[PDB]
Design a protein around this nucleic acid. Structure first.
Ligand SMILES: [Zn+2]
Ligand SMILES: [Zn+2]
Lengths: 277, 277
DNA sequence: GACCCTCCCCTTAGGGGAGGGTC
DNA sequence: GACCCTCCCCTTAGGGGAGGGTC
């Protein structure tokens, strides 16, 4: 009143940094009532401090400074609408985070899964829960043929749904009394899904199915060109000796263990086939 | 396999921009297996594409690239923990937005309130709902004395609670048969609160109370040095003529109408006193 | 003729000083 | 001796070209 505030005074009163005030000046969002033409000092009236309310509040909810310059130009009925938009945007983030929170949980459940596995290289018969997936025909693809680029299209879709990208790669093949690896070929290659949201227009060459819930003869181990086939043989023998009946393809899942370009790569292999009790 | 991918190929396969790939190279987060020493072209193996899974997923949840370089160096048990932290951080934002969504709603209710007021300059008797507030003693402060800087401390606290800053300024004074404005002085000055969260250590000079729910003789109008007092007189006369009994101080609320430094300032004044039916 | 490469400029909202006057 | 001012540099994660070789 009938006197001015120095930038530092305003800074203490409005709890805004002096740097912020200068910036808001330059950007023409909030300029001092008067600026001493000689010393360049900035002077503010007590009556204009009220404009920092709109700025401080809009800044709190994260609106762009360039956006604020528009807000302090609209009427109440328009500001009312402005806030209605913010609520629409908040609900949006709430849905996003709520879903993201769910996905992280699932990713953790499955992560803990392979961390607390009975024993490696040994065949176990456990009761598996369903695992939703997206697969495709593996036309002319086998164990010694696959490439990460083979899951390219599969990953693209998953990414547009789950947001997250798959970390594990899947394949399936007919249960046969194999003799050598060059004797086997993948039927489908797949990648697990984590979201329940409808993926963008999906192409007809992609199939959304699942790995049935049920009893499975499983075996897990760390990948090794040699152990890959020897372990399958081990699985096969287990079914043969117990005279078990297979009621599904052999499912294969390969998960990387570290993602560190410094240490030598190593993958976890998981094979399991569903049986009739 | 036994050949390389050009940056553009990797870009199409992993659905990552060529610009992003070069950047990830420079930043040493994801570098090409081989770079032609003459043409400087970047070449990627199909086996390293798997490192883009961790990057793409971590990028999705917004982790800093410098942070990813650490993530791809930890073990599964550690990555598991990493995600547990993300869930803690997500819950945090969920609480924040959920609360923010609530505050915007209240701000809108009250905003609509003064937009759909019966008539200006006229006294009305309506049933008001409670309005929580934070007030302080207005030692030596009156209508022709107040300054926005007088609410400085009050605003500081509100800001640390509601996050939002108050847009309306309040005051209260004893109901008397006033003759002139220099005859009146404010008892307390206050600012409304919007959050239900415990504000930081509050000083004992701040009082958290409310404007009681009840029947009030109200009057609203656009501020004018002259109309301010004439309208109070109008309120006073209304109580006197109906022989109404006042059971509260006169409450005053001043809200700005536009926050636009281009147009002439204008405020909305709201005065009301509680009566015994 | 597409592909790829290396600069170089630009973007949010100021925080950190440095060098140097001003209340 | 506090206060304030004007540069100037720095920060995230790349997107946009420009000028010019390369598959
Ligand atoms: Zn098929
Ligand atoms: Zn008191």
């Amino acid at each position: 009143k009938e006197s001015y505030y120095s930038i530092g005074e305003v800074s203490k009163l409005a709890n805004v940094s002096i740097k912020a005030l200068r910036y808001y000046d330059k950007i023409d969002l909030f300029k001092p009532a008067y600026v001493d033409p000689d010393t360049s000092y900035r002077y503010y009236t007590d009556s204009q401090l009220i404009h920092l309310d709109l700025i401080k509040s809009l800044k709190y909810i994260g609106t762009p400074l360039e956006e604020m310059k528009k807000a302090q130009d609209l009427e109440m009925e328009e500001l009312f609408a402005f806030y209605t938009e913010q609520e629409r945007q908040i609900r949006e983030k709430l849905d996003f985070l709520s879903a993201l929170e769910q996905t992280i949980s699932l990713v953790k459940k499955r992560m803990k899964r392979q961390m607390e596995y009975p024993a490696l290289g040994e065949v176990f018969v456990l009761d598996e829960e369903e695992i939703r997936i997206i697969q495709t025909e593996a036309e002319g693809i086998g164990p010694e043929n696959v490439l990460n680029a083979s899951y390219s299209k599969l990953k693209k879709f998953i990414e547009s749904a789950d947001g997250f990208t798959n970390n594990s790669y899947g394949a399936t093949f007919s249960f046969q009394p194999y003799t050598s690896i060059d004797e086997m070929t993948y039927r489908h290659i797949f990648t697990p899904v984590l979201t329940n949201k409808q993926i963008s227009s999906i192409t007809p060459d992609m199939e959304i199915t699942t790995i049935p819930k049920g009893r499975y003869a499983c075996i897990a181990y760390n990948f090794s060109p040699e152990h890959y086939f020897l372990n399958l043989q081990k699985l096969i023998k287990y079914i043969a000796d117990r005279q078990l009946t297979v009621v599904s393809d052999v499912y294969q899942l390969i998960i990387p263990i570290h993602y560190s370009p410094k240490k030598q790569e190593e993958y976890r292999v998981e094979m399991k086939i569903r049986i009739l009790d």
